[PDB]
Amino acid sequence: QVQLKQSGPGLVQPSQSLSITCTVSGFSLTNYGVHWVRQSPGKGLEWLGVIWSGGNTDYNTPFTSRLSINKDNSKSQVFFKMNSLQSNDTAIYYCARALTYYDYEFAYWGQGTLVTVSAASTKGPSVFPLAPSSGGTAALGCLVKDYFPEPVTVSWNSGALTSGVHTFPAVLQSSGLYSLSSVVTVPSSSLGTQTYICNVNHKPSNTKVDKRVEPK
Amino acid sequence: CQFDESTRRLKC
Amino acid sequence: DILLTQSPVILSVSPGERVSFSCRASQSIGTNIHWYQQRTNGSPRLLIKYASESISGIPSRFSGSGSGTDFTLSINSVESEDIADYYCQQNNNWPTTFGAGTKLELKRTVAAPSVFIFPPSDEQLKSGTASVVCLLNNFYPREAKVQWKVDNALQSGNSQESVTEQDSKDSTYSLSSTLTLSKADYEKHKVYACEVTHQGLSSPVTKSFNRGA
């Protein structure tokens, strides 16, 4: 199968450079060009550039000066680098491949890299339990508090629990740190038999926490 | 409507 | 650069209904237009290429037409999994540009929320901060009121709300309201109440606990 997998999300300071690595499989960089697209609150979807099979590069006009795309055919890696970022350069950055080697209909996308431009510093979150205590249905969850920057991933029982899971959008607190809750509803009779763990990963800080959630 | 990086959805 | 205007910004339809998205170009671009779907926390998914040609693996209820400046993406019988934003992209002129997108919302029957309240954990109290969480689960429509009360005193300004996007299966929303206190304030009070107002309830529902028990 055809895939594109980009490097992790993270913080870049004002006036500093952004660097993302796009690793591909299911095809060869010598037969297809790799495009770069971003998606920002201010400007939405926005085509940035492309590196072709033969190594040539095209850059969208407002980025010719601060954009540089390179690759390594043998290692199947495309390297994205953009210089002197400002606040409005915060966006989801994607690498993508078209259907045919020369075209622009983007059938394959990377999972995206959320980039935050801020002179603040990284901070891992604390994880606190939302302990259960109607109609045989019990609610429980995890509180993922005081981290920066976005994002954080949450799953349940190492991916085995998905039904009834609600992970809420993060909200920015007055401290400038983010916070979210992730909940799941389960049968109350299963609280004695099953273990419920929320798997929290905050990649910008290499903070990885499994929190067991029990009735108090 | 503005795009939201947290949810990757438009927020209107 | 070609300007692409998608109309309208929000569409709200019911399951099984037909629905059309509109993408207009600032000048003629022939049939050089592509359509994309974006689900919650997803990357764009290619639906149609060159105005009308189908894409492998995309279900048949998706189709598109148009030429020149006026184009239409269509879903002839919409489903709950179709909840997403939809974009158009032109590539008749360099550089390729995207439209701003249309949000597709789904109507469904009124559903009352299931309310749960969580006191703060002793683990969090050790840092000197208390978070009281109120959960409104699986309700429709989105509008709802959460009123916090501590020892019958109305709380204002010290809570924050987060709402999920629409569920792809049952089309509901879920809401979290988090009331945040200092530990000193939390220890000085007893009765913590969350009152929920929603169209699906014939009375406000209150979930409360006494600190300790």
Author numbering:
A (entry chain B): 1 to 133, 138 to 220
B (entry chain E): 1 to 12
C (entry chain A): 1 to 213
Publication text:
Multiple strategies have been developed to modify monoclonal antibodies, including chemical conjugation and protein engineering. Recently, we identified a cyclic, 12-amino-acid peptide that binds in a cavity formed by all four IgG domains of the cetuximab Fab. Owing to the location of the binding site within the Fab, we have termed the peptide a meditope (medi-, middle, + -tope, place). Based on our observations, the peptide–Fab interaction does not affect antigen binding.
Based on the few available cetuximab structures at the time, we anticipated that the hydroxyl of Thr90 could be oriented to favor interactions with the carbonyl O atom of a glutamine or glutamic acid. We also noticed an extended water network in an apo structure solved in-house; upon binding of the L5E/Q meditope, the waters could facilitate interactions between the meditope and Tyr182. Unfavorable repulsive electrostatic forces between glutamate in position 5 and Glu154 HC are likely to be responsible for the low affinity and the fast off-rate, which is ∼30 times that of the original meditope. The lack of productive interactions with the Fab resulted in a drastic ∼760-fold drop in affinity compared with the original meditope.
